[PDB]
C-alpha cells in the first residue's frame with residue numbers, strides 16, 4: 001500500500017476483488033487483483049505463489065500481463081496491465097451488428113490464448129465468459145484471457161487427476177467422471193463458449209445440478225430449430241470437434257486454429273446479423289449476475 005493508490009472496483013472473484021490502481025511515483029494505471037484471507041487452507045502460500053508464477057510466465061497479446069506480485073498479511077496483490085474494454089460478453093450484447101464472423105474472430109483470439117497456455121504447460125481449468133476481457137476499442141479490442149487462480153502446470157502431454165475445479169456449466173466429462181485429465185478440458189470449455197457465442201444460451205443446462213452433470217457426462221447437446229438452421233455447418237462442425245466426450249479425440253487448440261470456420265472466416269463464416277443471439281445473451285448475462 002506504500003506504492004499504489006486504489007480506485008474503483010472493476011469486478012469480483014470468489015475471494016477477490018479487482019480494482020483499478022495507480023503506481024504513485026510513475027502515475028501509471030494498472031489493475032490489482034486483491035485476494036482476501038477469509039478462507040484459510042493447508043497449501044495457501046503454494047496456491048498464491050503458483051498463480052503468480054503462472055501469470056509471470058504468460059506473455060501473449062491475448063493474455064493479461066502481470067506487472068507485480070505483493071504479499072501482505074491480510075491480502076495478496078497481483079498487479080496487471082490495465083485493460084479498459086470490459087467483459088467480452090458485455091461488449092457483444094451492446095453490439096447492433098453481430099454475426100458468425102464476429103463469433104469466429106472472438107473464438108480465434110480465445111484459441112490463441114489457450115494454445116499459448118498449453119505450449120507453456122499451463123491448463124487454465126476455468127475458461128468461461130467472465131474470464132474473457134477486452135482491450136479498449138481505442139487500442140484494437142483484443143480479447144484477453146484472465147484469472148489463472150485455478151490454473152495448473154503440466155509436464156508435456158501427461159495427464160493426471162489434478163482435483164475437482166472449474167465452473168459447473170463448463171466442466172468436462174473427464175473431470176466429472178473423476179478421470180485423469182489435462183489440456184483437453186480447456187477445449188471442452190472453449191466449445192461451450194463457442195456454442196453460447198452463436199445462439200446466446202448454453203449447450204448443457206438444468207436448474208438441478210445433478211441433471212446438468214448427467215447431461216455433460218452423456219455429451220448430449222444439440223442444435224435446435226429454428227435458430228441453428230441459419231448457422232453454417234462449418235461452425236457446427238467445429239463445436240462437434242470440441243465437445244466430444246473422449247478427450248483423446250477432441251480437437252486441440254492448435255488444430256482448431258486451422259479449422260476453416262476460423263482461418264477462412266471471410267468465405268466460411270456467415271455475415272448475417274443474429275439478433276436473437278443478442279437477445280438471449282442479454283438474458284444469459286443477467287441470470288449469471290444473480
Ligand SMILES: CCN(CC)[C@@H](C)CNC(=O)c1cc(-c2cnn3ccc(-c4cccs4)nc23)nc(N2CC(O)C2)c1
Nearest residue numbers: 010011012013018031064080081082083086130131146147
Ligand atoms: C476476470 C475475472 N473476474 C473475477 C476476478 C471477473 C469474474 C469479474 N470482472 C473483473 O474482474 C474485471 C476485470 C477487469 C480488468 C481490467 N484490467 N485487468 C487486468 C487484469 C485482470 C485480471 C487478472 C487476473 C484476474 S482478473 N483484470 C482486469 N476489468 C473489468 N471491467 C468491467 C469494467 O467495464 C472493466 C472487470
